[PDB]
């Protein structure tokens, strides 16, 4: 049973490491996702990389 306790302690360490790492990683992923769906949620399609460059022509007209 003391052998079992030793191996179980090792496994507890592994679980704790894994849960901590995964929660941090996916939390940063969540923050990036929220920034995207806040600042540019298909606003890129409104931009459409048009590069109008026509204000100069309107000023000439």
């Amino acid at each position: 049973l003391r052998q079992r306790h030793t191996e179980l302690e090792r496994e507890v360490s592994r679980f704790e490491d894994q849960t901590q790492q995964q929660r941090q990683q996916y939390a940063q992923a969540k923050e990036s996702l929220t920034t995207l769906n806040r600042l540019i949620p298909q606003v890129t399609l409104l931009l459409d990389e048009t590069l109008i460059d026509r204000v100069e022509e309107v000023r000439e007209e």
Partner: protein
């Protein structure tokens, strides 16, 4: 006179275009360095999938770790 209104409206359009470009650049530099700014919806979908992975991973880890801790309690009583 029509061209005056056209000019004002187009100036606001340029304003919005620069806003979008600046925000795109700042995010693509914060995460990634140049990160498919042309079409970034797919990354939003994958990140939502990774949030689902978050829920799955956290629940599985918690329940398993605590269940084996209860097994440790049984071993302790033994």
């Amino acid at each position: 006179q029509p061209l005056r209104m056209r000019l004002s409206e187009l100036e606001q359009r340029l304003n919005n275009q620069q806003n979008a470009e600046r925000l795109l650049s700042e995010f693509c530099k914060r995460q990634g360095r140049q990160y498919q700014a042309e079409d970034l919806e797919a990354l939003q979908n994958e990140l939502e999938a990774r949030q689902e992975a978050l829920s799955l991973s956290v629940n599985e880890g918690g329940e398993r770790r605590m269940e084996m801790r209860q097994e440790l309690e049984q071993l302790k009583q033994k």
